[PDB]
Amino acid sequence: LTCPEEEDTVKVVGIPGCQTCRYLLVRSLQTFSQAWFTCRRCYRGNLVSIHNFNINYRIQCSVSALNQGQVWIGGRITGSGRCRRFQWVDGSRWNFAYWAAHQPWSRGGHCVALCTRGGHWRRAHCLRRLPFICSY
Amino acid sequence: PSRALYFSGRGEQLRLRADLELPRDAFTLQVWLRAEGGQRSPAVITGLYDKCSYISRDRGWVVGIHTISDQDNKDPRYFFSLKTDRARQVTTINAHRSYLPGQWVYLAATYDGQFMKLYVNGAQVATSGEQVGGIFSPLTQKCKVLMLGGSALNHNYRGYIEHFSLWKVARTQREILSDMETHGAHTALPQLLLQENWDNVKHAWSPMKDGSSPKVEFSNAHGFLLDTSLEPPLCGQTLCDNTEVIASYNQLSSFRQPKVVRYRVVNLYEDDHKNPTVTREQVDFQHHQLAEAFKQYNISWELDVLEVSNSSLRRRLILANCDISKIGDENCDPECNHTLTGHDGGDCRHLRHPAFVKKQHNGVCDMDCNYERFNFDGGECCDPEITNVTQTCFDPDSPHRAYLDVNELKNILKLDGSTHLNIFFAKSSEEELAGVATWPWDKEALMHLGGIVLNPSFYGMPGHTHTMIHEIGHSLGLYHVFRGISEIQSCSDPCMETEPSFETGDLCNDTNPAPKHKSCGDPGPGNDTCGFHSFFNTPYNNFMSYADDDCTDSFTPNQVARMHCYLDLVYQGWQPSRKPAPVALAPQVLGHTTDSVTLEWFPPIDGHFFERELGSACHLCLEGRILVQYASNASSPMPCSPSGHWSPREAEGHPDVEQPCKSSVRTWSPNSAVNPHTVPPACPEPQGCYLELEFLYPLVPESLTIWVTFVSTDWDSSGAVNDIKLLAVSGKNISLGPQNVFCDVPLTIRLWDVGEEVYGIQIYTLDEHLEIDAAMLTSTADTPLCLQCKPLKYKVVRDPPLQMDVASILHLNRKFVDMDLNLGSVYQYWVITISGTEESEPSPAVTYIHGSGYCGDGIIQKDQGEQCDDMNKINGDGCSLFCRQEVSFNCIDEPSRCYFHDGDGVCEEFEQKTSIKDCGVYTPQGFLDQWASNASVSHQDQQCPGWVIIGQPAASQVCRTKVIDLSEGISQHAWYPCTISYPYSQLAQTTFWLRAYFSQPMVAAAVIVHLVTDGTYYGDQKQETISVQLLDTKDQSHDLGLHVLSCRNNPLIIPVVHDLSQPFYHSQAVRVSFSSPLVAISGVALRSFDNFDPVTLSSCQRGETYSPAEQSCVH
Amino acid sequence: CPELAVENASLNCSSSDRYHGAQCTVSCRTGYVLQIRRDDELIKSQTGPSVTVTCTEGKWNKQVACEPVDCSIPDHHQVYAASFSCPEGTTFGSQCSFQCRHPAQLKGNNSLLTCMEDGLWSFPEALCELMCLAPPPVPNADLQTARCRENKHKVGSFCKYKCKPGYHVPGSSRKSKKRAFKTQCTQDGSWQEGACVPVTCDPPPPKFHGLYQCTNGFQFNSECRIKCLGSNVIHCRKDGTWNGSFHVVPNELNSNLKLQCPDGYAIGSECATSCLDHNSESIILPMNVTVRDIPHWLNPTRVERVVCTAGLKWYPHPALIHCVKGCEPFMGDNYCDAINNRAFCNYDGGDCCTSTVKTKKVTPFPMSCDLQGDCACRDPQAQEHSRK
Ligand SMILES: *[C@@H]1O[C@H](CO)[C@@H](O[C@@H]2O[C@H](CO)[C@@H](O)[C@H](O)[C@H]2NC(C)=O)[C@H](O)[C@H]1NC(C)=O
Ligand SMILES: *[C@@H]1O[C@H](CO)[C@@H](O)[C@H](O)[C@H]1NC(C)=O
Ligand SMILES: *[C@@H]1O[C@H](CO)[C@@H](O)[C@H](O)[C@H]1NC(C)=O
Ligand SMILES: *[C@@H]1O[C@H](CO)[C@@H](O)[C@H](O)[C@H]1NC(C)=O
Ligand SMILES: *[C@@H]1O[C@H](CO)[C@@H](O)[C@H](O)[C@H]1NC(C)=O
Ligand SMILES: *[C@@H]1O[C@H](CO)[C@@H](O)[C@H](O)[C@H]1NC(C)=O
Ligand SMILES: *[C@@H]1O[C@H](CO)[C@@H](O)[C@H](O)[C@H]1NC(C)=O
Ligand SMILES: *[C@@H]1O[C@H](CO)[C@@H](O)[C@H](O)[C@H]1NC(C)=O
Ligand SMILES: *[C@@H]1O[C@H](CO)[C@@H](O)[C@H](O)[C@H]1NC(C)=O
Ligand SMILES: *[C@@H]1O[C@H](CO)[C@@H](O)[C@H](O)[C@H]1NC(C)=O
Ligand SMILES: *[C@@H]1O[C@H](CO)[C@@H](O)[C@H](O)[C@H]1NC(C)=O
Ligand SMILES: [Ca+2]
Ligand SMILES: [Ca+2]
Ligand SMILES: [Ca+2]
Ligand SMILES: [Ca+2]
Ligand SMILES: [Ca+2]
Ligand SMILES: [Ca+2]
Ligand SMILES: [Ca+2]
Ligand SMILES: [Zn+2]
C-alpha cells in the first residue's frame, strides 16, 4: 500500500513517566487491520498498548486537536464465551483499563478506540476509518 | 398515646372528606413527619389538587420531598410549591439542607396572600413573594381535593405522619413554635380548620378505591429533650473533632490522666526461628525512646513481641506503599524500586526499550530478559524447578512471587488488632517516610488489617527513632501540621487554614499553618502556597512535621488532647486499666421550677450505653435494647468464573466514603473484582447481579439501611436496586419490592411482620455501576442478645454537697431533678459514670445560679456569650444547644426565633459584606464600582459569546472548582475559551487575555474581578494565576501582579499600589491575562473614589481650588 | 432646586426650604409600577416604594415614572374556551369581557375580568362549560355504551367502538386480532379518531401477480378476479383465509443488477437477484418515489428472487427494480449515523435515540453532525417521539 505522508503525522514524546516510549500519531483515516499493517510496515511496530495513566493522558493531549472524536489504539476482543479476553495487538498483557461509562458490556464492535475528548476508551467497530497511533 | 400513620411507597394515599371546606385566601399546614431514606423523586406529603377535569394542571399547593437538580437526583430537600388560579407560573421554595432520613421533622407551610413561607422545625428556611392573591375562587371551590401522602399520578411518600393540622389563617412564626410545643388540641380556635390525631382515620379521610390504606402504629415522636448527636465539622471525622468535646479535653486535666496502651511488634522468623526481622536490641531501644517521648504526655506503652516462624514470609520482600498493579506499567514508580521487585519489573532500568519482544523460552532463566518488556523470560523464572521462586519470580500474575504487600501479610497473619497496636515491617525505596498508619476512624482500626507499617532497617536507628512516634501519633488521630497548606485538593478547599483554628487544617489551634519542608526553621518564599508568601511560628520542632529527627521533639497540648480523646473514644480495648469513659460534655440545664432544677447530660464519650463483657454482643446494644449491627461477611458471584463467590471486604464495616455521590474504592461494584483483561459482562436481565451481606448476630429485625453511594448518571430505568431478599435462618427468603434510592442520603427500609430471625440480605441490581458502601440492621426493642447486658449508672455530684440520701443514689436514665436549692446560691454539678463499681472521671462542671439564667430559659443574656436562647436544646433549628446561632441563620426575638437569611431575597445591614447572592457586591462608602462595557476577548466563538462580561456579574452563580468539563451551564454568565480545551493547552502553551473597557475613565483604586470557576483541572492538581493589568488613555500598561484564584476570594480584589510622587492616571481598559483555559470571568469592576476624582483636581491651575462636593475646579 | 412633580405618586420633603442639599421621598400608589431610569441607563425597578431624590447642580439626577401595572393580554389558559374583548386596555382598574364559544355554555351572573392591584386578572365569576356532543359515525363499526348515544357527556371519558370481524385498527398483529377500540372526548369538544380499515387476508402469491382486479385490493372481503375446472374467483373468510388460490433475457436491467438463475428461464422458476455494487440493495421503487429522495419513514420492499407469472413475465421486473445505496454495517454499534437513520436500515438499530442505544448516550461517527437534523432520532417507539 502507500505509507502516510509526514504532513498528516505528528510525534508524541516526552511522557512524565517513561523516557524511552515514543509514539507517532497518523491522522489519516484507516480501518483497524489497515492501521495495523501500516504501523507494522512503515514504522516497524504494532499499535500503541497503553499501560499507565501518563501514556493515556499524553495521548489524549496529543489527539484532542483532531476533528474526529475517536482514534485507534491496538486493543481487540479475542474471546468466545461468557467472558471474552481483551488483548493488545503487540502481545503485552492487559493490566490497565480506562473505559468510558457503560462501555465494555454494552456490545458494539470488536475493536478498541480512544475518545479524543476525555481520553476514556470505547468499544468500536473495526471497519471504522479513524486516526491511529503507532509505537516505534 | 400518640398515634401515627405509616405510608409505604406502594400507593397508599388518602383524600379529605368532601363535607369539609378547604381554605381559599390564606392557609397553614403543620405536619410532624418521619421520612424514610430512599424516596420517589417528586414525593408528595400533602397536596391540594383540582379534580374538575384536565384544565390548567399543577394549580394548587403541594408540599413534599424533591431533588433540587432534577437531571441528577442528588440533593433531596423538603419543598413547598404554590400556583394560584390566577398566576401564570408555579413557585417552588425549598429548605436549606438535605432532609434527614430518620428524624421527626415539623414541617410548616404558611401562605397569607403575599408571602409563602416554609418552616422546618420551627425555623424559617424559605420565603417567597412571587405569589399574590387568593388561591381559588368560591366558584371553583367544588372541585378541589386535599391529598395526604400521595398525588393523583401516584407521587407517593414513604414514612410516618403524626400530627396533621390545617389552618385557614397564616400563623406567625411564634404561633408555629407554640403549635410545635402543644401536641394536644387547638379546639378553642375557630380558624382551626382541621387537626388529626389518628384515633379515627376513616371518619375524615377516605382512601382511593384501587389503592390501599396506610398502616396505623404508635409514634413516640416527642421522645427526647436533649439532642445527644453532636456533629463533626467539615474537616473532621468523628465526635472527637467537635469543638466542645475537644475543648473539654483541652481545658480539664482530669481527662488527661495517665494511660497504658498495649502495642505489639510483629517480627518474622524463619522455620528454625533464627533470622529475625528486627533484633531484640533495637526493639528494646525503640521501647526506651518511645517511653521517653510519651512520658510527659501521660501515655505509657506496654511492649509485646510476637515471633512468627515462617520461612516463606521471611524470604519474601514486603512492600509498604507499592501497589502490585503498578509493576508492569511503563512509568517508573519510585516506591517499587527494589532488587527483589525487579527494578519495578524492569520499568525503571535505563536500558529498557519499549519494543515488547516476546522470546521463545529455552532452558534457564536470564536476568537481562526477566523484565516486563520480555514477558519475564516466558515464565521460566517463576518455575520452582528451574530456579528459586523467592529471588527470581518478579511476575505479579504468578501466585508464588518474590514480593508481597503489607495488606497480604496482614491477611496471612490475621492478628488480633482489637487489643494491641500491631506494628508491621515493610521496605520503602523512596525513604521519605514509613507505610500508611490506619486512622482511628478507619474501619480497619480495630481489625486485623490495621496498625502501623514501618521500615525495619531504620527501626531503632539512633538517627531514625522519631518515625515510630510520628506514625503512632498518626494512629491516634493527629494529622500532619502541613495539612492545611499542602495536603489540600485546591486553593478553594474549606480545610485550608488561613489562621489557626479548631476546624481548619489539622484541627489544632496551637499549630500555625506551615508547608512541608525538611528544614528546621521557617520557610522562605511562597511559590507553591496559594495566598501566603511567608510563615512564622511554624511548628518545625513538632513530631508531626517533616523535619529531621534532630529537630522534632515535642507535641503541642492540643495534640495531646486529641490523642487522649481518641484513646478514650475508639481505643478502649488497647488499655488494661478498666476505668470507664467519662461524660465529655457538661450537664445541661433543661428547666427549673420555683424550688427545683432539672439536668440532662450526654452519653459517655465511648458511645456505649452498657457495661463491657468480652464474650457477648453488648457493645452493639443502644440506649434501649436495640442491637444495631453492620455487615460481617459479604459475598458476590464472580462474573467470569461460575461458582467463584469472591468476598468483598468493602461494604462490610461502617460506611466510610468521603464524597457521597462519587465513585470510590471503599464500595462494592458488581464487576469491581474482575481483571482488566476479561470482559465484564452485563448483569442478568430478570434478577440482576446481587450482593449477599451476612450479619454476625442473627435476630428479628425492624430496620435495614443500605448506603448506596454511586448510581448511574443517565440511568433511564425506574429503579436502581432491583429487589432486596432477606435471608432467614429457617431457609425462607422474604422479598421486598424495588427500592428507589438516592445518591446522598442512605436507603432506609422499615420491615413489617418479619417474625423469623434474619441472618443476612441479598441486594439485587440491574445497574452495572451501582456502589454499595455498607449495610446496617436494627433489631426490635427487646433483643434477646441484649437482655444479659447491664446498663451503665450515673452518679451526680454537686459542689455544695447533696444530702447523704440523695448523693449516694445511682441513676439508670440521664435525667436528674433536685429540689434542695436556695433562692440565690451558686451550685456546680457534674456526673461520674459508674460501670460496675469502678467510677470514671468527672464531667465538666455546670455552674447554675438559682436566680439567674442559663442556656435553656429563652432569655438572651449577652454577658454569658449567648447569641441566641431558645427553650429546646435541639440542634435542628437555627440556635444550637450551646446558645450559639448556626451558620447562615439569624435569630431576632428575645425568645429566639431564627430564620435562614443567606438564601433570602431582602438585604440587611449585617449581610452586605458576605451575602453576595442577596445584596450586591460590597463597595465601601468612599468608593464606587463601575462595571465593564464592550469587553473584547482573545478566543471568540459561537458557543462562548464573549459579551457576557458586559454589565453586572451573576453573583448568584456558585463558584466551581476541580471541574473537568465546563460546557454544562456556565456559558450564560461568563466567558472562558471554548475553542481550546485543557489537554490541548497542556500540549501547546499559549496565553488567553480579556480586555474590558469602561464608559467613564476613572482612577483605579482597585480592580474587582468576579469568577465562577477556579481554573483548576480535575486531575492536574496545579494552582492557576491571573495577570491583571491596567491600560491608560495613552495606551500605557501598568502591571498589577500575578494573583492566585480561589472560590473563597470569589469577588477577587486587586488593589493598585500607586506612588504619590507619580501623577494620577486615568485608566480606560483592564487586561486580564491567564494561561489556563478553564478560567471563567463573569465581570470586571473598576473601583474609584466616590467623593472626588484626583486626576481632574490636579489639573486645576492656580486660583482654581479643588471642589469634591461638585467634583470640579472652583474659582 | 426646582419643584419635582411625579405622576401617580405622593411626594414628601423633610425640609420646607429648597436648596442644593435637600432630599425628597416619592412613593407611588398601589396599582402602579416604578421605572427608575437615568441618562442612557435602564436600571431595574425598586421592590419598595421608598425612593429619595436629591437635586444636583440645579438639575435632577434621574426621572421618576410610575406606569400602571400591566396584566398580560388575556391568555387562553386564563379562561378556557372563551374570547376576550377589552376596549379599556390592560392597565390597572381596566375591565375586560369574556364570552364563550358556541359549544361551551356561560353559567353565572357576571362575565367580567379586571386587572387588579396585584398584577393579575381577577377570578371569573362565570364559567364556560364545555359539553361534548354526539360523535361522528364510524363506518364498519358499532357503538357499545348507551350513554355515548346521548348528546351530553363529561370531558375526558371513553366510548367504545367495535369493528366488524375482519376489520381492525391497522397494525394489528396476526395472533392478537383485536377488533375494538375507544375514543375519548378531548378538551376542544371533539373526540379521538380511529377508523376500522380492512387489513385482513393476504395478497396472492407472486407467481400469479399482476392480472388481479379486486374490489378493494388486498383488503378484507375483497374479491380479486383475474380475467381469462375452477376459475380465479376467491373469497376471503372471517378468520383471515381464502377458499382457494390462483392458477394459470430481461435486458431492461438496473445499473448494478445481476440475475443468477439456478433453474434457467423456465416457467415458474425463481432466480436470485443481486446488486453487483457491494453497498447496494435491490428494491421495488414507487413511481412517485425517486432514487435520491426516498423518505425516512418509507420502507421499500426488498427483492429476493425473480419469479415468473402466468403471462410468462417476471413479476419483479428489473426495469422497476432499483439498486439503491444499501445499509452500512455500522448498525447497533452504539453509533448514530446519517446514512442508516431511516426505515430502510431499521433506524440504524436505534443508535440515534437515547432510550434505545445500549450506552444510553447518542454518539455521531462524525462529531460535526446535526444532532437535531441529519443525526436526529426518528423512531416512533422511543419516548422522545412519544407524547408520554
Ligand atoms: C498528666 O497527669 C497528671 C496527673 O497525674 C497531671 O498533673 C496535674 O496537673 C495539674 C495542672 O495541669 C495540677 O493542678 C494537678 O495537681 C496535677 N496532679 C497531679 C497528681 O500531679 C498532668 O497535668 C498531666 N499532664 C498532661 C500533659 O496532661
Ligand atoms: C506461613 O505462610 C504461608 C503463606 O506464605 C501460610 O500459608 C502458612 O499458613 C504460614 N504458616 C506455616 C506454619 O507455614
Ligand atoms: C532505582 O531506580 C533507579 C532509577 O530511578 C534505577 O536506576 C535503579 O536500578 C533502581 N534500583 C536500585 C536498587 O537503585
Ligand atoms: C537457591 O539457589 C541456590 C543457587 O541458585 C541453590 O544453591 C539453593 O539450593 C536454592 N535454594 C532452594 C531452597 O532451592
Ligand atoms: C488559639 O490560638 C490563638 C493564637 O493563635 C490564641 O490567641 C487563642 O487563645 C487560642 N485559643 C482559642 C480558644 O482561640
Ligand atoms: C517552592 O515550594 C516548594 C513546595 O513544593 C518547596 O519545596 C520549595 O523549597 C520552594 N522554593 C523555595 C525557593 O523556597
Ligand atoms: C463468608 O461466607 C462464605 C460463603 O457464604 C464462606 O465460605 C466463608 O467461610 C464466610 N466467612 C466468614 C468469616 O463467615
Ligand atoms: C429462596 O431462595 C432459594 C435459593 O436460595 C430458592 O430455591 C427458593 O425458591 C426461594 N424461595 C422463595 C420463596 O423465594
Ligand atoms: C429512667 O426512666 C424511668 C424514670 O421515669 C425509670 O424506669 C428508670 O429510672 C430509668 N429507666 C431506664 C429504662 O433506664
Ligand atoms: C464595541 O466596539 C466596537 C469597536 O468600535 C464596535 O464595533 C461595537 O459595536 C461595540 N459594541 C458595543 C456593544 O458597544
Ligand atoms: C399615571 O397613570 C396614568 C394612567 O393611565 C398613565 O397613563 C401614566 O403614564 C402614569 N404616569 C407615569 C409617569 O407613568
Ligand atoms: Ca511502574
Ligand atoms: Ca531463557
Ligand atoms: Ca492548625
Ligand atoms: Ca465500605
Ligand atoms: Ca440565658
Ligand atoms: Ca435550639
Ligand atoms: Ca437576606
Ligand atoms: Zn506522616
Residue numbers in the entry:
A (entry chain A): 87 to 222
B (entry chain C): 13 to 1127
C (entry chain D): 1135 to 1362, 1371 to 1390, 1400 to 1539
Sentences from the paper on this structure:
Originally discovered in the circulation of pregnant women as a protein secreted by placental trophoblasts, the metalloprotease pregnancy-associated plasma protein A (PAPP-A) is also widely expressed by many other tissues. It cleaves insulin-like growth factor-binding proteins (IGFBPs) to increase the bioavailability of IGFs and plays essential roles in multiple growth-promoting processes. While the vast majority of the circulatory PAPP-A in pregnancy is proteolytically inactive due to covalent inhibition by proform of eosinophil major basic protein (proMBP), the activity of PAPP-A can also be covalently inhibited by another less characterized modulator, stanniocalcin-2 (STC2). Both modulators form 2:2 heterotetramer with PAPP-A and establish extensive interactions with multiple domains of PAPP-A that are distal to the catalytic cleft.
To assess the molecular mechanism(s) subserving PAPP-A activity and the modulation of proMBP, we purified endogenous PAPP-A·proMBP complex from pregnant human plasma and determined its cryo-EM structure. The cryo-EM analysis generated an initial dimeric 3D map at 3.64 Å resolution, and C2-symmetry expansion was subsequently applied to obtain a final 3.45-Å monomeric half map, which enabled de novo modeling of most of the PAPP-A residues. The structure not only confirmed intramolecular disulfide bonds of PAPP-A reported in previous studies, but also identified several new disulfide pairs. In addition to the previously reported covalent linkage between PAPP-A-Cys652 and proMBP-Cys16932, we also found that several other residues of PAPP-A in this region, such as Asn683 and His689, contribute to the stabilization of this interface. In the PAPP-A·proMBP complex, the binding of proMBP induces a nearly 30° rotation of the βBD towards the PD, generating an interface between the βBD and the C-terminal subdomain of PD.
